[PDB]
């Protein structure tokens, strides 16, 4: 089994547009969404079909009812950020919480916070502690490690539940997350190298250039794109030397296949 | 389904030590929960373990072992105003409270 | 100061008589519960509010109804009375719902018995 992640979002806003949401909550299973509420709807609904599928009733109207406290609870924490920041206008509170399932069998746990997108507090489960960016996140710190049975809960939590959960989610989903779309890899020219591979799935790729057998600063990647339909493209370029004729050959890696296209 | 059990009742003697014993099968497990409720009284709280390992507070101390699913309430240098009922509760994977029916704490002075 | 405060104390029915249990909090808790303790099981959950503006059901709602009037206060509604909610009715609350360390505060409970 590859590497998955489950991760749990938060986004709060304390002035927001007449339309926008003030709270909005979404769940991830790798990079697929699961999970979401918002303070418009109310309610905690399935983002995936084999979420809804496996996940009875009486689930999405505990978790409502849970986050509907957990909105309010956002809404008193980022009054008190602003306030002592002494900030005016708007601004967003942000939460992510989660676990990965490595491929070798072992374990990470995280969560975390941030102020206008910017790290706030970073929970270490292993020291039990929080660390603070600022004085305004040091007040915090100092009464949430005041309540230790606190830190402990959240420790089990990463550790235990969030992984639990990710292997039910797993199977829930094994047609979807655990399938395998090779790329589909080409190369041409435009004056520079371009090596672009397509519809392939999971969206973790590796790809560049080596020039005479030898891997080089001078290649620009592309970023990992969603095609729409479910698979992704990526790509990467490199200069040509006109001074001097070299081997260059594009390497894409994508779940455990090596590709290797040589340019004539 | 989820399930909590504790002894129905216990009898021991003043002064002495009495271990109230909790085991629980449960669809996931955030913390497991004592309190204390005097005869015609409110429950109040009293510990709190989601770790294994014991935790002391008192007179009272609380145990947790997570792989056996099992915890105890452990009460030294018993008195007479310790006679009580002693409840035991797991908060489940949906943060959904499971009781046990509790145990009687009988005191001989 | 005063902690969770709920009344009545006891409480004699005859049934198909209506009921209803106040239960007040001033610690400024958010989440606020009503339970029932019947001899030889474990608290059993009627009705939750896990904040302010929204109630659910419980283990065993069914006969009864509920009412988050406003931050600190939460009434359990009996409509029709029947012999099988001759019990002792608890009420508590707690800072959140589902911080996990969280405890509840309990009210002084409410003994009913409702009689043919």
């Known amino acids: 089994m590859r590497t998955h992640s489950l991760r749990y979002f938060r986004l709060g806003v304390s002035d927001p547009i007449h339309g926008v949401p003030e709270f909005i909550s979404v769940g991830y299973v790798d990079s697929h969404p699961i999970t979401t509420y918002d303070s418009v709807t109310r309610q905690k609904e399935p983002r995936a079909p084999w979420m809804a599928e496996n996940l009875a009733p009486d689930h999405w109207e505990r978790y409502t009812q849970l986050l509907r406290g957990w909105q309010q609870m956002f809404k008193v924490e980022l009054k008190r950020l602003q306030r002592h920041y002494n900030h005016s206008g708007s601004h967003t509170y942000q939460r992510m919480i989660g676990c990965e399932l490595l491929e070798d069998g072992s374990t990470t746990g995280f969560l975390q916070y941030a102020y206008d997108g910017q790290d706030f507090l970073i929970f270490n489960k292993d020291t039990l502690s929080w660390l603070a960016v600022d004085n305004v996140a040091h007040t915090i710190k100092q009464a949430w490690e005041a309540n230790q049975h606190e830190l402990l809960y959240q420790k089990n939590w990463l550790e235990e539940e969030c992984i639990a959960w990710l292997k039910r989610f797993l199977e829930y989903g094994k047609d979807t997350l655990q399938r395998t779309e090779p790329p589909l890899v080409r190369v041409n020219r435009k004056t520079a190298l371009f090596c672009k591979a397509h519809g392939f799935y999971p969206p973790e790729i590796y790809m560049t250039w080596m020039k005479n057998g030898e891997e080089i600063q001078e290649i620009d990647y592309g970023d990992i794109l969603p095609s729409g339909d479910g698979t992704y493209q990526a790509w990467a370029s490199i200069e040509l030397d006109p001074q001097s004729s070299n081997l260059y050959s594009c390497h894409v890696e994508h779940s455990g296949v090596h590709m290797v296209l040589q340019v004539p | 389904g989820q399930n909590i059990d504790q002894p129905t009742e216990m009898t021991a003697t003043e002064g002495a030590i009495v271990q109230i014993n909790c085991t629980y099968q449960t669809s996931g497990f955030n913390g497991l929960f004592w309190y204390q409720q005097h005869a015609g009284e409110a429950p109040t709280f009293l510990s709190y373990?989601?770790l294994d390992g014991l935790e002391e507070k008192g007179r009272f101390s609380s145990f947790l072992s997570r792989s056996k699913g099992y915890s105890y309430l452990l009460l030294k240098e018993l008195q007479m105003k310790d006679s009580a009922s002693y409840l035991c509760?797991?908060?489940?994977?949906?943060?959904?409270?499971?009781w046990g029916a509790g145990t009687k704490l009988i005191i001989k002075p | 100061n005063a902690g969770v405060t709920q009344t009545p104390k006891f409480q004699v029915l005859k049934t198909g008589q209506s009921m209803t249990l106040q239960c007040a909090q001033d610690?400024?808790?958010?989440?606020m519960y009503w339970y029932r303790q019947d001899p030889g099981m474990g608290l059993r959950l009627i009705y939750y509010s896990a904040s302010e503006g929204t109630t659910d059901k419980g283990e065993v709602p069914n006969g009864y109804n509920v009412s988050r009037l406003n931050k600190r206060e939460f009434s359990l509604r009996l409509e029709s009375a029947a012999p099988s909610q001759t019990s002792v009715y608890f009420c508590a609350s707690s800072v959140w719902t589902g911080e996990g360390s969280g405890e509840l505060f309990f009210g002084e409970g409410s003994r009913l018995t409702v009689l043919e």
């Open positions: 610690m400024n808790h958010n989440s």
């Open positions: 509760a797991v908060k489940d994977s949906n943060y959904q409270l499971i």
């Open positions: 373990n989601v």
